[model samples]
Target: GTSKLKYVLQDARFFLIKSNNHENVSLAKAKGVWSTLPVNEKKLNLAFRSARSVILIFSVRESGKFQGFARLSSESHHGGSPIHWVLPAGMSAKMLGGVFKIDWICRRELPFTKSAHLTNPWNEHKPVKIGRDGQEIELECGTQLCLLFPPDESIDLYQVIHKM
Candidate 1:
């Protein structure tokens, strides 16, 4: 499990996606591809086109509250819609996929708050671990997640997979 956490923090490209439209979040939850994401195509293609895997932590608009995240197999970007794959069905249909995978984990049940951890998510950073166990994982508001991001030197598995 520790190895898995290491892979999450080190080997993958983690992205925090903020969306105001509940419809898009639900679309990702159901379809596995967030097609309408408000990201620049050239930049997204450059960063994620050849990525082995992409870890997406979804945050709410203006609240700094995360709703969920989706880990997907990144496909090549030719020039059309920028999409990624989440499951075998979507994977095979999308022209094969990566071995890495994680279904969308909703925060309503898991309860993830942003201000409790990271300073500003958009800053140049990566996720980090603060406590050995639950100390850094909980807050007075509720059971939240600590997505600490160091100066590129940095950077939750159970609750994420149990739901899937």
Candidate 2:
């Protein structure tokens, strides 16, 4: 088995979330792969701190199918910053904690499917209600996600995107 992680995800913090609308996907592509992600600052701060980069997977709605992916630049994110939508103490404050910058090095669109080289994200992870265009979404750190391989394999996720 190829024990070493030979991919963009090496030394990176990865997560998976589903998009509420197809428009979210269209808008992200139109904006040069930028997309805002909300997270619990308390939990995200600790996990993301040690990461060199971030890999985000975007999927279609309840189907749990892949839509696209983003490799966010590590330097642009710290723990994260205050999000604009949940400002001021109130009920909305409890739903969304904060957000981190979604600056990307590169992003790609994969044919929407329930299966890919990776595992289905919704099986174990729970959804987090938050504001990103009035939709509830989920967030799961990458360590739990696994690549499906017929045998041992190593792939540099970023390199695959960069050559494009």
Candidate 3:
């Protein structure tokens, strides 16, 4: 099976969260491809770090299904810094049942003390928590842009969050 991995390095720390129950989504709920319930951010020692980015990989139940993406995040939950809920293009508000893994790489040493919990997140896209007006213009990061969504949508990372 072609598993989803970002292909960075082998020395980086890796954390896997096998979602027990929160693995399904309705097509009309998730919104689009960039919609994911980032499994365990605090559990993988994600926040409060000098890391670069996180490559979120998902291996669906079907042997042929794969979803992967990577995005930037802030050191902590201050200043509205983003913890990108990155996901593949084939994903949506539809159904997705799989395991979510986060490949962690830090700019220096492991920039965390511990984790919040030893489990995946159980929250869903609450009906009251939808941001982004879907009207903002996306900018560019430079020339070395990468396909965070797939097909055509691309970004230089946090350099551009939306499109024109």
lDDT of 2 by residue, 1-164 (tens): 23433344466655555555566565554453333434433434455566565555566565444444454442224335433341333345335433344443233443433233333234333332112222222233243232321222223444534532
Predicted candidate 3 versus true structure: per-residue lDDT over 1-164, tens digit per residue = 01111323111232221221223221111322222333443433342143333333232333222233223233213223232333346544222222222222211111111211122222222211111111111112100111222431332222222210
Winner on lDDT (1 vs 2): 2
Ten-residue stretch with the least lDDT total in model 3: 135-144
lDDT of 1 by residue, 19-130 (tens): 5446656656666555322233233344455444355656545543455555554433344553443333322323321122235433342233334344323332223222
| lDDT score for residue 19 of model 3 | 20
Order of models, best TM-score first:
1, 2, 3
Off by over 4 Å in 2: 1-7, 32-42, 74-99, 103-106, 111-164
Which candidate would rank higher by lDDT, 1 or 3? 1
lDDT of 2 at 73: 40
For model 3, the stretches where C-alpha displacement exceeds 4 angstroms are 1-39, 47-50, 72-164
Q: Pick the candidate with the highest TM-score.
A: 1
Against the unseen true structure, what C-alpha lDDT does each candidate score?
0.40, 0.41, 0.24
Pairs in clash, predicted candidate 2: 7-156, 7-157, 8-157
lDDT over C-alpha atoms for residue 134 of model 3: 15
Give the poorly placed runs of model 1, Cα more than 4 Å off: 36-39, 49-51, 76-115, 120-164
